[PDB]
Amino acid sequence: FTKSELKRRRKTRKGDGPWGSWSPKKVIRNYPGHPEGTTALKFLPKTGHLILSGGNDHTIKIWDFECLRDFQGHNKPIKALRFTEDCQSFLSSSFDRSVKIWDTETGKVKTRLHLNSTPADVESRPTNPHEFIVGLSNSKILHYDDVQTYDHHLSSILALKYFPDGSKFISSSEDKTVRIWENQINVPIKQISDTASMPFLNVHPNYFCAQSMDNRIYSFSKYKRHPKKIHSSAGYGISLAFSGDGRYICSGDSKSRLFTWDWNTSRLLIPGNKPITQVDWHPSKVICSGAAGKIYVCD
34 close to 295: Cβ distance less than 8 angstroms: yes
4 is a contact residue toward other proteins (CB under 8 A): no
Show contacts with Zn ion in window 15-74 (CB under 5 A).
18
Cα–Cα distances (Å) from 84 to 3, 42, 47, 173, in that order, read: 63, 10, 13, 24
Of the pair 8, 110, the CB lying nearest other proteins is at: 8
Q: Are strands 217-220 and 89-94 parallel, antiparallel or unpaired?
A: unpaired
Question: Which range in 17-25, 36-44, 141-149, 288-296 contacts other proteins by CB under 8 A?
Answer: 17-25
22 is a contact residue toward other proteins (CB under 8 A): yes
Give which of 109, 117, 115 is closest to 92, Cα–Cα: 109
Q: Please give the Cα distance from 296 to 177 (Å, whole number).
A: 32
Q: Please give the Cα distance from 264 to 283 (Å, whole number).
A: 25
Among 13, 140, 204, 225, binds other proteins (CB under 8 A): 13
Among 6, 67, 196, 268, binds other proteins (CB under 8 A): 6
Q: Are strands 276-281 and 131-136 parallel, antiparallel or unpaired?
A: unpaired
| Peptide bond just before 18 cis, omega within 30 deg | yes
- The binder of 229, among Zn ion, other proteins, none, by C-beta within 5 to 8 A per type, is none
Among 258, 266, 272, 283, binds other proteins (CB under 8 A): 258
Q: Are strands 108-113 and 99-103 parallel, antiparallel or unpaired?
A: antiparallel
- The binder of 284, among Zn ion, other proteins, none, by C-beta within 5 to 8 A per type, is other proteins
1 is a contact residue toward other proteins (CB under 8 A): yes
Question: Which range in 69-77, 82-90, 93-101, 255-263 contacts other proteins by CB under 8 A?
Answer: 255-263
**What are the residues whose beta carbons fall under 8 Å from the beta carbon of 246, sequence distance 6 or more?**
228, 229, 264, 275
- The binder of 255, among other proteins, Zn ion, none, by C-beta within 5 to 8 A per type, is other proteins
Q: How far is the CB of 284 from other proteins (least distance, A)?
A: 6
Q: Please give the Cα distance from 126 to 170 (Å, whole number).
A: 13
106 is a contact residue toward other proteins (CB under 8 A): no
283 is a contact residue toward other proteins (CB under 8 A): no
Phi-psi region of 293 (alpha: psi -120 to 50; beta: other; left: phi over 0): left
226 is a contact residue toward other proteins (CB under 8 A): no
Among 69, 145, 255, 283, binds other proteins (CB under 8 A): 255
Residues that bind Zn ion (CB under 5 A): 18
Residues that bind other proteins (CB under 8 A): 1, 6, 9-10, 13, 17-23, 207, 255-256, 258, 284
